[PDB]
Design a protein around this ligand. Structure first.
Ligand SMILES: *[C@@H]1O[C@H](CO)[C@@H](O)[C@H](O)[C@H]1NC(C)=O
Ligand SMILES: *[C@@H]1O[C@H](CO)[C@@H](O)[C@H](O)[C@H]1NC(C)=O
Ligand SMILES: [Ca+2]
Ligand SMILES: [Ca+2]
Lengths: 257, 257
């Protein structure tokens, strides 16, 4: 179902009278807008086009009020201009109040560049759009957000660094990380947040757990106190929400006999 | 049925091998073309991209051959460029011959401005187009040509001028005029072509007829000899074809007792 048509003044191309007023309500499908232009336009000129006019509207917005033969200082004439609707709807109105030929206009549905919406990549197509993510993330079910793939990694070295996905840059939204540090049965590991610590707060909640002992929920803008664990195996959980601008955290683990 | 999709190198985002070659054949509906662009593009560089490449083709036309990471003097890289197919068809080919991540591309069907066809007015819409004419003409059945409305007019004055529709400018195509000069029963009218005479020739045929007596077929580039009729009523027939640039004719009729 293609959308396009033609509109003309009463009695076109003959002279129009002043006992017939007109309106046309044009509708394109969702995702489209309508473009209209005039091939012939000849209406009497009057201050602010109050006597004779062609008015273009979208919803309550008044896109334009036309009249005359040649645009002036306070009255506008279509010329060869193209008018676009705001939304998939356009209303054209023709009025005349008590020698002019009137007008001929054409309209056609046209695609809307809907990426004028997405977390990472916005892909536009005819009638709609969709989103995609960068390498390392996977589109969420909200179809717009990019969840990070931050789980399944483990640390075996005596000491190492951990952090939020894009540290020191805003971390993924609607993500849920899970970091792991596994060491020999003897050793004992101590964690201490380093550099910066920035997490959305009022707990975006960072939780550190290990065989009987819960830490957190951590949030806020300052390095939380250092933590001396018991185990040689610790797991960290960082769940996020949509808030973007938050640098995140970075932990430097270490262990001793 | 909306057209759009995604293409990637073997094993994307992992490094690609060299035992798998690829092609995708994209098809948009008549009236549309496909646009494609790369979100990720990382292929090994080689002179004229002979070892690794992404080739874009439309029919037999080679729109582009890609490779590398950054365009150079003899090798091209997508960058953030957008590629459009020629016609409603696009073919993407990926090759590799014996550390690079490959590529991710997206494509979407897009409308073709088919008024890049018509006699007078070309109107474009999604998937096709149509034609319209200026005031005084009516679209022919070929859906493209503008026939003139040159019939039904009569002349009653003792003397008057007649001519081709846009004299002295190219006359309408596929038109068929019929002029009439009616005078009192007594008078007798004489016709003589004036100014210019330009009609498509080898008879576009101008014929003058009146109660028993046929004149013509007139064509050519010079004023035809003057004609003294018998009747007080004469009718002229001018039929055209597609040839455009031909000024036409102009007759100055007169009559005497
Ligand atoms: C519209 O464009 C034509 C060229 O095709 C130009 O001659 C004409 O002046 C323009 N009309 C107006 C008033 O904008
Ligand atoms: C593509 O555009 C980005 C801006 O978003 C720019 O930083 C990048 O250099 C461009 N890539 C190339 C190689 O054209
Ligand atoms: Ca769109
Ligand atoms: Ca089109």
């Amino acid at each position: 179902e293609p959308v396009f048509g033609r509109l003309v003044s009463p009695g076109f191309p003959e002279k129009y009278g002043n006992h017939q007023d007109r309106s046309w309500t044009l509708t394109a499908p969702p995702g489209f807008r309508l473009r209209l232009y005039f091939t012939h336009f000849n209406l009497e000129l009057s201050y602010r086009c109050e006597y004779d006019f062609v008015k273009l509207t979208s919803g309550t917005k008044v896109l334009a009020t036309l009249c005359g033969q040649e645009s002036t200082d306070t009255e506008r004439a279509p010329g060869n201009d193209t008018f676009y609707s705001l939304g998939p709807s356009l209303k054209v109105t023709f009025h005349s109040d008590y020698p002019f030929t009137g007008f001929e206009a054409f309209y056609a549905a046209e695609d809307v560049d809907e990426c004028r919406p997405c977390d990472h990549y916005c892909h536009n197509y005819l009638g709609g759009y969709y989103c995609s993510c960068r390498v390392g993330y996977i589109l969420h079910q909200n179809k717009h957000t990019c969840s990070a793939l931050c789980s399944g990694q483990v640390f075996t070295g005596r000491s190492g660094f951990l952090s939020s996905p894009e540290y020191p840059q805003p971390y993924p939204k609607l993500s849920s990380c899970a970091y792991n540090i596994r060491l020999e049965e003897g050793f004992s590991i101590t964690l201490d947040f380093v550099e910066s610590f920035d997490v959305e707060m009022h707990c975006d909640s960072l939780k550190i757990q290990t065989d009987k002992r819960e830490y957190g929920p951590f949030c806020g803008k300052t390095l939380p106190p250092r933590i001396e664990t018991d185990s040689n195996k610790v797991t960290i959980t960082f769940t996020t929400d949509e808030s973007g601008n938050h640098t995140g955290w970075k932990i430097h683990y270490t262990s001793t006999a």
